[PDB]
């Protein structure tokens, strides 16, 4: 589901934005994803981030008709230097 | 480029200018059944003619 992934990216960005304005800043350089993702122990918030991903973007026009299949990705959230981050969906076995 | 909300590959991007494109009837005219996909129609065409 496209729009849900869309909402994930938004929502999570919005929360991090909360902690950010909690000080005063949206500046990205101040908050490298360490800050938000290190487990509580190491002194991070430990928030479990499945925003990141890359989000299948293919050519809406026809995707109102055919189901054209993924041709492209749109960067969900970002970094500055990247690394990556593991996302929940990958640690949960699917129902089937 | 702006007014159509397109982007020349090396180009400046802007805002929609006619934002609501999303309204559409489900209507047979330009449908797929009845069209031939032979050459894709890149943007630069749409900015060129």
């Amino acid at each position: 589901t496209e729009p849900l992934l869309d909402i994930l990216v938004k929502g999570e960005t919005r929360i991090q934005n909360r902690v950010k304005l909690g000080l005063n800043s949206k500046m990205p350089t101040r908050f490298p994803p360490a800050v938000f993702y290190t487990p509580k122990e190491l002194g991070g918030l430990g928030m479990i981030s499945a925003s990141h991903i890359l989000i299948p973007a293919s050519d809406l026009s026809w995707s109102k008709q055919t189901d054209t299949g993924i041709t492209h990705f749109r960067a969900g959230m970002t970094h500055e230097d990247e690394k990556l981050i593991p996302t929940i969906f990958r640690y949960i076995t699917t129902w089937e | 480029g702006k007014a159509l909300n397109n982007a020349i590959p090396g180009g400046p991007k802007f805002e929609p200018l006619y934002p609501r494109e999303e309204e559409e009837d489900y209507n047979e005219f330009n449908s797929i059944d009845r069209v031939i996909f032979r050459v894709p129609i890149r943007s630069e065409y749409k900015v060129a003619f």
Binding site: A57, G69, I70, R74, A75 | -
Partner: peptide
């Protein structure tokens, strides 16, 4: 060549708007 893939704009959408070809699916 923005071909219809991508966004109206990343102003509200929280992403960077970056779009890249998908290596996987071609045939």
């Amino acid at each position: 060549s923005y071909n219809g893939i991508g966004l109206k704009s990343a102003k509200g959408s929280s992403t960077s708007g970056h779009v890249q070809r998908s290596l996987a699916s071609n045939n």
